[PDB]
Enzyme design. Structure first.
Site, PDB file in Angstrom:
ATOM      1  N   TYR A 156       3.717   6.201 -12.595  1.00  0.00           N
ATOM      2  CA  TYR A 156       4.307   7.491 -12.228  1.00  0.00           C
ATOM      3  C   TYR A 156       5.343   7.961 -13.269  1.00  0.00           C
ATOM      4  O   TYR A 156       5.451   9.159 -13.532  1.00  0.00           O
ATOM      5  CB  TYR A 156       4.971   7.388 -10.830  1.00  0.00           C
ATOM      6  CG  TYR A 156       6.137   6.413 -10.756  1.00  0.00           C
ATOM      7  CD1 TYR A 156       7.447   6.841 -10.968  1.00  0.00           C
ATOM      8  CD2 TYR A 156       5.930   5.067 -10.464  1.00  0.00           C
ATOM      9  CE1 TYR A 156       8.515   5.945 -10.937  1.00  0.00           C
ATOM     10  CE2 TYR A 156       6.993   4.167 -10.408  1.00  0.00           C
ATOM     11  CZ  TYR A 156       8.283   4.611 -10.647  1.00  0.00           C
ATOM     12  OH  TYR A 156       9.328   3.728 -10.588  1.00  0.00           O
ATOM     13  N   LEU A 178      16.258   1.906 -12.179  1.00  0.00           N
ATOM     14  CA  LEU A 178      16.123   1.553 -10.769  1.00  0.00           C
ATOM     15  C   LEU A 178      14.666   1.231 -10.405  1.00  0.00           C
ATOM     16  O   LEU A 178      14.406   0.583  -9.390  1.00  0.00           O
ATOM     17  CB  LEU A 178      16.661   2.694  -9.882  1.00  0.00           C
ATOM     18  CG  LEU A 178      18.141   3.026 -10.023  1.00  0.00           C
ATOM     19  CD1 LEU A 178      18.529   4.126  -9.072  1.00  0.00           C
ATOM     20  CD2 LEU A 178      19.023   1.790  -9.820  1.00  0.00           C
ATOM     21  N   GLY A 179      13.742   1.698 -11.232  1.00  0.00           N
ATOM     22  CA  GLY A 179      12.311   1.510 -11.047  1.00  0.00           C
ATOM     23  C   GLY A 179      11.548   2.118 -12.201  1.00  0.00           C
ATOM     24  O   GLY A 179      12.051   3.032 -12.861  1.00  0.00           O
ATOM     25  N   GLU A 180      10.348   1.583 -12.474  1.00  0.00           N
ATOM     26  CA  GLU A 180       9.471   2.028 -13.560  1.00  0.00           C
ATOM     27  C   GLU A 180       8.042   1.623 -13.259  1.00  0.00           C
ATOM     28  O   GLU A 180       7.808   0.508 -12.795  1.00  0.00           O
ATOM     29  CB  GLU A 180       9.920   1.457 -14.918  1.00  0.00           C
ATOM     30  N   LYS A 215      14.379  10.574 -10.535  1.00  0.00           N
ATOM     31  CA  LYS A 215      12.980  10.201 -10.732  1.00  0.00           C
ATOM     32  C   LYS A 215      12.429  11.086 -11.845  1.00  0.00           C
ATOM     33  O   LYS A 215      12.465  12.316 -11.737  1.00  0.00           O
ATOM     34  CB  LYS A 215      12.172  10.327  -9.429  1.00  0.00           C
ATOM     35  CG  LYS A 215      10.810   9.662  -9.501  1.00  0.00           C
ATOM     36  CD  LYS A 215      10.120   9.704  -8.155  1.00  0.00           C
ATOM     37  CE  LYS A 215       8.677   9.318  -8.262  1.00  0.00           C
ATOM     38  NZ  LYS A 215       8.106   9.034  -6.920  1.00  0.00           N
ATOM     39  N   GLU A 237       9.534   6.747 -14.329  1.00  0.00           N
ATOM     40  CA  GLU A 237      10.691   5.870 -14.090  1.00  0.00           C
ATOM     41  C   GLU A 237      11.750   6.514 -13.189  1.00  0.00           C
ATOM     42  O   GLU A 237      11.762   7.728 -13.000  1.00  0.00           O
ATOM     43  CB  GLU A 237      11.340   5.434 -15.427  1.00  0.00           C
ATOM     44  CG  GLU A 237      11.986   6.565 -16.216  1.00  0.00           C
ATOM     45  CD  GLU A 237      12.665   6.145 -17.504  1.00  0.00           C
ATOM     46  OE1 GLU A 237      13.641   5.364 -17.434  1.00  0.00           O
ATOM     47  OE2 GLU A 237      12.233   6.609 -18.583  1.00  0.00           O
ATOM     48  N   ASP A 250       3.162   4.837   3.412  1.00  0.00           N
ATOM     49  CA  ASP A 250       3.370   3.613   2.595  1.00  0.00           C
ATOM     50  C   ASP A 250       4.695   2.930   2.974  1.00  0.00           C
ATOM     51  O   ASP A 250       5.499   2.545   2.118  1.00  0.00           O
ATOM     52  CB  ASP A 250       3.294   3.868   1.080  1.00  0.00           C
ATOM     53  CG  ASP A 250       2.953   2.610   0.271  1.00  0.00           C
ATOM     54  OD1 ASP A 250       2.497   1.603   0.883  1.00  0.00           O
ATOM     55  OD2 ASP A 250       3.192   2.607  -0.945  1.00  0.00           O
TER      56      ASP A 250
END
Ligand SMILES: COc1cc(-c2ccc3c(c2)Nc2c(cccc2OCCN2CCOCC2)NC3=O)ccc1[N+](=O)[O-]
Length: 268
Positions: free
Chosen positions: A18, A13-15, A36, A20, A118
């Site tokens: 930080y 879903l994201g990488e 996460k 992934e 943010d």
């Protein structure tokens, strides 16, 4: 019940730096959650404080030596960023409904003394019914404690969404900074473009806005009623900037535009 604690990681879903984020599906129930995989202590501490329908739900965390696992609400609708058509935006009633939900989430966070710092369409997720959820409390901080406000001084956020006081003043109030980034998110939803690289007098687009040259892009694409709201949000002086209680009294904020989620119907 055996195996209910087991989750299969099925899609990224994201990488980033930080670590992934993976979509996890429960082996027994097939429940979907976002995991996460990893500053991080503060993110967990802030997440343990949150409980709101427009804030990504935190289910818990687990530590496996050097690796931290954060179990978060999975939002199958993806990111608001991908609902914004480049240089077009989206239908004004959709942007109004997303903006109402963003305000509900931000009111909640500010009410418990938390600033996200943010806010941007990448951090605004959508569930199965297109309900907006504020995501990623990795840059978030407590600005009010024991009913005492503390002024911020740390450079945080993303330049096209940051308030001008962050680049000009040593100290600033937390809440007008989040209000400013919500106005930039509203601009992006309605025009499909960001107005400036950063809010500095050296940026021609920013100087043009303070000179009220709304005959230019992105402003030319925005109807006069949401544009009048943006004129109140994107105010350089954070002390003169509209507050969220006053955003809720704005004419476009309260304009009937959008029909509810389509319900099945038959005739005769
Ligand atoms: C808490 O912190 C994070 C959370 C996510 C996150 C979590 C869940 C989803 C999600 C992202 N997005 C998402 C969902 C469903 C489908 C697709 C999604 O992401 C879009 C993928 N983007 C990156 C790859 O290129 C296309 C855009 N729903 C989701 O629920 C991503 C990054 C961070 N982080 O630390 O930077």
């Amino acid at each position: 019940v055996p195996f209910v604690e087991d989750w299969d990681l099925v899609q990224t879903l994201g990488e980033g730096a930080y670590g992934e984020v993976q979509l996890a599906v429960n082996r027994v129930t097939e429940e979907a959650v976002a995991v996460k995989i990893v500053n991080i202590k503060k993110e967990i501490c802030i997440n343990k404080m949150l409980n709101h329908e427009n804030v990504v739900k935190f289910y818990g965390h687990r530590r496996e030596g050097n690796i931290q696992y954060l179990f978060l609400e999975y939002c199958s609708g993806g990111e608001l960023f991908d609902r914004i058509e480049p240089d077009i935006g989206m239908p004004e009633p959709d942007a109004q409904r997303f903006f109402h939900q963003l305000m509900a989430g931000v009111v909640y966070l500010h009410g418990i003394g938390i600033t996200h710092r943010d806010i941007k369409p990448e951090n605004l997720l959508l569930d199965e019914r297109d309900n907006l959820k504020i995501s990623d409390f990795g840059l978030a901080t407590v600005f009010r404690y024991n009913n005492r406000e503390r002024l911020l001084n740390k450079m945080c956020g993303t330049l096209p969404y940051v308030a001008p006081e962050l680049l000009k003043r040593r100290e600033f109030h937390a809440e007008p900074v989040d209000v400013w980034s919500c106005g930039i998110v509203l601009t992006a939803m309605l025009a499909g473009e960001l107005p400036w690289d950063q809010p500095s007098d050296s940026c021609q687009e920013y100087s043009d806005w303070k000179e009220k040259k709304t005959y230019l892009n992105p402003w030319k694409k925005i109807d006069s009623a949401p544009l009048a709201l943006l004129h109140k949000i994107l105010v350089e002086n954070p002390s003169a900037r509209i507050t969220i209680p006053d955003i809720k009294k704005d004419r476009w904020y309260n304009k009937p535009l959008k029909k509810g989620a389509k319900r099945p119907r038959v005739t005769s």
